[PDB]
């Protein structure tokens, strides 16, 4: 039935816990009772991130309260909505459809942990964890937090830790070899370039199962324009707790699961202030977001070629930059590899 | 029984209505049960605004995280919210916390219409009716249909009505001369200012009776300052449908209430650009917000001593402002003396 | 002699200076040698606008140094130099651009002044004083030293004189009432607008000759738009030393003519940043730049009606503004209506 | 007689011609009169210096106008300037004291060959020319015209030609492999850094005696920042004609001098907009200015560590960027290493 060891198992469940899967959904005020898992679709969702950009383009060329009705109200049919008896949301404000977005996006994932789920139970092998983990094509390798590779990546997390994230805390408790399914033929043409390091790159627990069975990906195409500050990418940070910030929990859930990996960032295009970038400088391969405090240069480790900023992060010298945070974004999904994937507790401060 | 002429008291009881209240908090996602409407303190809410206002200074400033923690969860329980099965939008997007500005705003006069009501169940010379009408403190003396002023009037609700503002059309339906006991007296220095014409003045049907009864009022002081494009004061449009876009009719309540009043302007400080401001410059006693639409002014009817914009909506000539039509801020409220109330029905499109 | 007031004669012998003309052109590094005075002319000086304004619309927009170089050839050429044994400056500096505007200016007048001076001028009755005046084309008078009027005068003078501007003393030596033939029949119609104030205007001596025969005019066409601050019109200011900065009086030539004409504002487009007005805003009969001081508004007084803002001088509300002090530009020749011509002597702190 | 070889003998007298010193002086309007070569010095130019700086604080900082002529004053009272017939410039335009940055740092040079020139005169054994070579304390050797290293340098020059700079083309008529004496070592520490490369650098012919014996300095610690774009520092072109128009030849003077030497940048904190640097942040070593255009990325020719951008100019995707074309910026003067010297001339069609 089974052999996992414990953290494998209390990880294997997580990322197909149907359960989770709902309450989510719930979140954002979907009615489950016409949208549930079971009728779930990335070609759906995407007709949404369509409707969403149709309506950037709306207020941004000032369009009538009409055609800005219409639109708000094809949205809310594609995709039901569960408010109970309050008026539904306006969708004309530019932060209403970015919140919008980040529902859409975090859908995503969700569509296929489930589909991707929803078979493959046939030939009777070991407990369910077994006929699935199979077909996350990924060895969940194994890490020990006492031999070699670990003590390193404990440094990281502790200091990677910025000062303006004290509504919470950190602790290490599961790291796992992560290796997908080959994606290594894949980034092998990307090591033509030097700048590799590894960053972070945090997201909701509900989300993790398809980061394995593709990872990565970019926001697809009928994504809105104005959606990410630096683009349609994969963005990545030198921060922690920064990147923990996209694991959202609450009180009673202090306990998600963020990611590591090295990105190809070649010759990095370096802004400090928003731009939505669509094509890279000729010579430029990824782009930086200088931040206003970053991990001390003066002191970082390195090693089989890529490298870590773990100093205690200082302050930099930009002080005319909009981020507070650094910021890494690549725009080639073969231009990354995920090596690690850990998971703590976030016990906060109620 | 009554003695108001029967349009008078559709609107007494309309404005008075014990149902439609209770309506309008569920709808704002507040929880009758912990938040009884019997229980709104004028106090209560300033508590309210107040956590706003840190809420947002700390968040234009990346300040920390447990702050945002913190002050959420005051507020949500000061203002009990019951999101029924949906997780608590946390208020760090600085962005949903407008639409909470804007509720507390709502929930002002809802808090006066009961107190006002509750405390004259006393007394029975008449209807409930007009025991509810001797409480306005005010004089509602219907207008003949069928004479100049209901051409005027009725002619300047039409002409200035804005073409993207499509999802509605307004048919007069009634038409009021109110007169707010003393507004007159206070209004009186403000005559011999320059500058005075009638403008428009949407609101929500359940802000009536607390403004005719205490006239139009600022935001309190603990309330936010960059609440409103151009800081704390009394509103105003020259364009009937910019201002009837604040009934909130919808439609199941296709009809609502807009008030036409005389404002004291004189020196107006221009501006095209969103400035939250404290205060005017020497010689200057209000503020006008430039739009790309304006009545036109060869067009400007004088009703002895008072202008009138019944002039059909025109291009202004500015073209680098950041509003479609034109706003007037007071910062007084001695400098208003309301004169007309109207009922509309709205006939949408949609 | 003549029978003009002693005063009314040294006036005309100091506009009509044809050794002073020369000594400006010469300060300019003209070659007087290849053009003399003599040889000036309006559409040689108007050609030599549209090259300015050529380098504007090529220079900024990215050029070729083949350009500029023959762009700034066509001009030296056009218009003779003599820099001596030093390589001439290259018109791509905007600031270097700019004075050849502040160049072409007091030429365009200085022509007017000479063509003007010498065109029948030689008659037995009357001497040359007396003969150059009814040049003029208008009537000239002495005010006194006594009369309300210059009582008004001097205390406007004084009162408004910048407190940047110290370095220099003021000191009214001799009043003059004015009227351009025809002027009264010119203005008749705007004298029924609002908003008529006593504006100042400063310019060089050798300049007068022409505008009290021609009347205050605006910059021709072809002159480039970001020549000028508020685009091509006239300019006045409610600081008498922010126009007298304006008379180009060294201490050579320590006295000095300045203006008080009636301007017609109308409706004022309050702009506090720099833009190149083509066509004004609907309703709007000029445009009034905002600074950060100004005079006090509650100590206008009036004379003969006019708004005069002679009140000593106040910080604005409005502080961020390009602009230290007010200016008013009209942008039709018959919103003036010259008044006062003053005869001031500068004491100097060079 | 020499015996050095002819074409190094032309380029001693060359920059050392003390005629076509004075010709600078006068370029500058500089009163030979009361300001003779001799006479110059490092305290005296220094003090200007420090003026210079004062017209810049007190104009950014404000102040009032009697100031601005104080320090106007100031400096010409201490570099006499004869500007013969003309009105006295004055310093405030902001950039009025750019053309003033520009005079004092030839002074300085023009001053230390003259000094050098004097040091060691009343000799005696070969001509004067083995004497001042000596002096410049630099190893200097003529690279035969057939050289493969010769084919490089022209290759560079050839391809990293502006095609904006069309009014003259450029002709090779010598080739110098320069070593000064020193450089080599306290440069060592710096080889160490990554991004060496060879960059351009244009000045003066009368400037070049300075440069070579104390090598590329940057702006005294008197001067003022608001001279330069991005700080005091040393700049550097990859586009020859960029460094070119630093020669300031003319259709009189035709031969310039300009420098290849490689810089050790490392670390670059890229910008586009123009910024007067103080501090550089945490691990950034250099400065690089992004243009509209730049030489072929994929065109690169490395020789051993230090690359050699001798491709074409292409377009990059900066499209923001406030500069046509790049730039290189480093703040410390031991971390360049000249390498060569050309002797090349201009080719106006003017
Ligand atoms: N992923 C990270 O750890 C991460 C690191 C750094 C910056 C990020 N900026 C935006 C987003 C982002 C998160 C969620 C969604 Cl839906 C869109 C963008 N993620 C980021
Ligand atoms: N209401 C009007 O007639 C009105 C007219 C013109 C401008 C306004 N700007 C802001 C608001 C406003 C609306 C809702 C809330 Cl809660 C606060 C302010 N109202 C306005
Ligand atoms: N003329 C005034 O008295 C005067 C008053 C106020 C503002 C002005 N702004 C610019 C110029 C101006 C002056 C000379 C040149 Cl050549 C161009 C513009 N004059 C001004
Ligand atoms: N030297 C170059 O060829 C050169 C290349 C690139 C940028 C430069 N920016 C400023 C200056 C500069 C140097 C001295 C002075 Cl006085 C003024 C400007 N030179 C530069």
Redesign the interface.
């Known amino acids: 039935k089974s052999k996992l060891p414990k953290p494998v198992q209390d990880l294997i469940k997580m990322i197909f816990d149907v359960e989770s899967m709902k309450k989510a959904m719930?979140?954002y005020?979907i009615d489950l009772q016409k949208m549930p898992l079971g009728k779930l679709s990335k070609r759906q969702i995407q007709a949404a991130y369509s409707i969403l950009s149709e309506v950037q383009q709306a207020v941004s060329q000032?369009?009538?309260?009409?055609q800005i009705?219409?639109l708000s109200?094809r949205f809310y049919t594609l995709i039901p909505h569960?408010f109970?008896?309050?008026?539904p949301?306006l969708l004309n404000?530019a932060?209403?459809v970015?919140?919008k977005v980040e529902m859409l996006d975090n859908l995503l994932d969700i569509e296929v942990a489930y589909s991707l789920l929803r078979g493959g139970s046939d030939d009777s092998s070991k407990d369910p964890i077994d006929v699935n983990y199979e077909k996350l094509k990924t060895d969940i390798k194994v890490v020990d937090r006492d031999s070699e590779e670990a003590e390193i990546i404990r440094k990281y997390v502790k200091n990677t830790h910025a000062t303006?994230?004290?509504?919470?805390d950190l602790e290490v408790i599961d790291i796992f070899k992560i290796e997908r399914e080959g994606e290594c033929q894949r980034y092998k043409p990307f090591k033509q370039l030097h700048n590799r390091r590894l960053l972070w790159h945090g997201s909701r627990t509900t989300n993790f199962a398809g980061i394995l069975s593709q990872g990565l990906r970019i926001a697809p195409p009928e994504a809105p324009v104005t959606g990410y500050m630096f683009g349609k990418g994969i963005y990545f940070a030198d921060m922690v707790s920064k990147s923990a910030?996209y694991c959202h929990t609450?009180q009673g859930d202090p306990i998600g699961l963020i990611l590591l990996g090295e990105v190809a960032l070649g010759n990095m295009?370096?802004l400090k202030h928003a731009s939505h970038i669509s094509?890279?400088?000729?010579?430029?391969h990824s782009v930086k977001g200088?931040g206003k405090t970053?991990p001390?240069?003066?002191a970082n480790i390195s090693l089989d070629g890529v490298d870590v900023p773990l100093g205690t992060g200082?302050?930099?010298?930009?002080n005319?930059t909009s981020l507070?945070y650094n910021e890494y974004i690549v725009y080639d999904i073969a231009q990354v590899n995920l090596k690690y994937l850990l998971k703590l507790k976030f016990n906060?401060?109620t």
Chains 1, 2, 3, 4 share one sequence.
């Open positions: 719930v979140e005020e000032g369009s009538s309260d009409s009705l219409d109200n569960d109970g008896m309050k008026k949301p404000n932060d209403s970015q919140a303006t994230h004290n509504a919470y910030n609450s295009y370096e094509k890279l400088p000729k010579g430029k200088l970053t001390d240069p003066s200082i302050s930099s010298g930009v005319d507070l906060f401060k």
